[PDB]
């Protein structure tokens, strides 16, 4: 019989959502070389993933609209292009299906989609195929979407530090951690917030939900809770397969610079590429770094250099590196790094915990506030920056607590314990190993 299995894949076609889904598809395509995988992005998301990359012969790339009519210029905020894509609806997705079917000469038999592309559920339903939802965001934020009314009621009535005890396994989460998007009602709602708020009703319709994380690190009662909501909850290890990686010239010599530093002594600072911190927090971070005296590597956008204090880069040049880009996975895996100062993006958090690097957290948007709370209060591998915003004095105190002080010993020790839990989770008898196989068979069986 000819194998006619044909998986269509819909990334949420933006930045940090793209590599984790490519990573999972590369793994699936490698273990099932007789199965077609059709990866359907926009022109910009496709350029972002596939420009310098070799892809296996069973992965084909197709292009659909980004929802930005020619001549339109989106404003400079992170939501507009999300809305415009989401506004293209299931018919734009079915244009992708059409291209995939025409090329492969195979009907689609299964859809994997980033959970935010909720219109692809409608597409799966039309085709009568299983819909597999992929979750690359903070694992614990799944629970919020089944409890919006309780959460909204609490956030409006109770104190900012009040705990969300109604979420099993997540009683350490607080009102102040809740993503603002899920609270906005009226003019402030966006298509993007409305899409996320539909997840409580969308996700139970998935044949499975695949979480991009380590089951062993999520609170076991939260896992049990989500299992009770979903048809199937599968964890697949987020670590990159060899095929995901594209070698890089470390143009800044970070690694060799790090080699000259002592164990767990260096602060690595990065706000990721979607956040622009308020200018005064950028100044704060620089003042704190200089005054701390600690060695540091700060991956900082070029356009932000002109707002650094006059002479800061120069005065700190003999102990600090301020650079536009670093090989972050290699930096975080370097034994000289003693703390990661982070906005708590999901990939950055995954890299930090898997490498035993404790964190100082300043969440900026979306569900980063959930991740920050998990880090400080559940895993206890870090602290939210004293003050909740970067200030010179508060950040100097957090730096000191984690890098040097006895009071930070527990956190440093917990970071090592969690590294060891991750090493054991990615092992061959990890349950993620079983879950990956389960996912493979769903696709086999489709």
Tell me how far apart the alpha carbons of residues 384 and 55 are, in angstroms, rounded to a whole number: 40
Beta partners for residue 360, in sequence order: 341, 383
Active site residue 424: no
Question: What is the stated resolution of the deposited model, in angstroms?
Answer: 1.9
Tell me how far apart the alpha carbons of residues 88 and 425 are, in angstroms, rounded to a whole number: 39
Tell me how far apart the alpha carbons of residues 338 and 292 are, in angstroms, rounded to a whole number: 14
Least Cα distance to 130 among 439, 433, 435 occurs for: 439
Residues spanned by the domain of 396: 249-424
- Output DSSP code: residue 51: S
Tell me how far apart the alpha carbons of residues 8 and 129 are, in angstroms, rounded to a whole number: 10
**312 shares a domain with 243:** no
Catalytic residue among 6, 17, 177, 435: 17
Quick check: helix, strand or coil at residue 206? coil
**178 shares a domain with 46:** yes
**218 shares a domain with 110:** yes
Q: Cα–Cα–Cα angle for 364, 370, 373, nearest 5°?
A: 100
Active site residue 17: yes
**397 shares a domain with 319:** yes
Binding-site members are 16, 273, 325-326, 328, 343, 347-348, 351
Q: What is the CATH number of the domain that holds 349?
A: 3.40.50.2000
Instruction: Centre a 10 Å sphere on the Cβ of residue 159 and count the other Cβ atoms it contains.
Output: 10
Tell me how far apart the alpha carbons of residues 358 and 337 are, in angstroms, rounded to a whole number: 9
**284 shares a domain with 176:** no
Tell me how far apart the alpha carbons of residues 49 and 305 are, in angstroms, rounded to a whole number: 28
**300 shares a domain with 182:** no
Least Cα distance to 44 among 104, 102, 84, 94 occurs for: 84
Tell me how far apart the alpha carbons of residues 54 and 56 are, in angstroms, rounded to a whole number: 7
**436 shares a domain with 316:** no
Binding-site members for UDP are 16, 273, 325-326, 328, 343, 347-348, 351
Give buried/exposed letters for 38-77 (b at 16+ CB in 10 A, else e): bbbbbeebbebbbeeeebeebbbbbbbbbbbeeeeeeeee
Catalytic residue among 6, 66, 114, 367: 114
Quick check: helix, strand or coil at residue 324? coil
List, in order, residues 6 or more apart from 363 with CB less than 8 Å away: 343, 344, 369, 371, 372, 384
The CA distances from residue 104 to 3, 42, 91, 108, in Å, are 12, 19, 20, 9
Tell me how far apart the alpha carbons of residues 445 and 32 are, in angstroms, rounded to a whole number: 12
**271 shares a domain with 166:** no
**378 shares a domain with 234:** no
Quick check: helix, strand or coil at residue 421? helix
The pair phi, psi for residue 351, each rounded to 5°, is -65, -40
**168 shares a domain with 144:** yes
In terms of phi and psi (left: phi > 0; alpha: psi -120 to 50; beta: otherwise), the region of 330 is alpha
List, in order, residues 6 or more apart from 405 with CB less than 8 Å away: none
Tell me how far apart the alpha carbons of residues 60 and 47 are, in angstroms, rounded to a whole number: 14
**273 shares a domain with 419:** yes
Tell me how far apart the alpha carbons of residues 371 and 366 are, in angstroms, rounded to a whole number: 10
**172 shares a domain with 51:** yes
Contact 9, 23 (CB under 8 A): no
């Amino acid at each position: 019989m000819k194998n006619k299995q044909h998986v269509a894949i819909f990334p949420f076609p933006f930045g940090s959502h793209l590599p984790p889904l490519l990573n999972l598809v590369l793994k699936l395509a490698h273990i099932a070389p007789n199965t077609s995988f059709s990866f359907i992005g926009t022109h910009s998301s496709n350029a972002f993933l596939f420009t310098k990359r070799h892809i296996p012969n069973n992965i084909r790339v197709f292009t659909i609209s980004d929802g930005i009519p020619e001549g339109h210029v989106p404003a400079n905020n992170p939501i507009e292009k999300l809305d415009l894509f989401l506004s293209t609806g299931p018919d734009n997705l079915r244009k992708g299906i059409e291209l995939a079917v025409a090329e492969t000469k195979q009907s689609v038999t299964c859809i994997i989609a980033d959970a935010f592309v909720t219109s692809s559920l409608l597409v799966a339903q039309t085709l009568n195929v299983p819909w597999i939802a992929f979750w690359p965001n903070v694992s614990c934020s799944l629970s919020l979407y089944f409890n919006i009314d309780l959460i909204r009621d609490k956030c409006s009535k109770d104190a900012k530090n009040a705990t969300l005890d109604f979420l099993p396994g997540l009683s350490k989460l607080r009102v102040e951690d809740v993503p603002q998007d899920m609270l906005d009602v009226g003019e402030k709602e966006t298509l993007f917030s409305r899409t996320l708020n539909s997840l409580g009703v969308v996700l139970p319709q998935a044949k499975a939900v695949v979480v991009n994380f380590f089951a062993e690190l999520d609170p076991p009662l939260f896992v049990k809770y989500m299992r009770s909501k979903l048809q199937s909850l599968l964890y697949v290890v987020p670590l990159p397969c060899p095929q995901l990686l594209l070698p890089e010239i470390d143009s800044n010599g970070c690694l060799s610079w790090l080699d000259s530093k002592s164990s767990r002594s260096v602060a690595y600072v990065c706000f990721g590429t979607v956040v622009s911190p308020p200018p005064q927090e950028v100044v704060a971070v620089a003042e704190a770094l200089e005054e701390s005296g600690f060695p540091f590597v700060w991956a900082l956008k070029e356009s932000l250099l002109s707002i650094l204090p006059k002479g800061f880069v120069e005065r700190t040049s003999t102990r600090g590196k301020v650079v536009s880009w670093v090989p972050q996975s290699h930096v975080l895996s370097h034994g000289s790094v003693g703390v990661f100062v982070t906005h708590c993006g999901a990939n950055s958090v995954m890299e930090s915990v898997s490498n035993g690097v404790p964190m100082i957290c300043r969440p900026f948007f979306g569900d980063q506030g959930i991740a920050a709370r998990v880090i400080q209060d559940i895993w206890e591998v870090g602290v939210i920056v004293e003050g909740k915003v970067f200030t010179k004095n508060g950040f100097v105190k957090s730096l000191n607590l984690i890098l040097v002080q006895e009071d930070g010993k527990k956190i440093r020790d917990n970071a090592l314990k969690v590294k060891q839990i991750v090493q054991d989770a990615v092992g061959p008898h990890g349950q993620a190993a079983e879950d990956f196989n389960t996912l493979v068979e769903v696709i086999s069986s489709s």
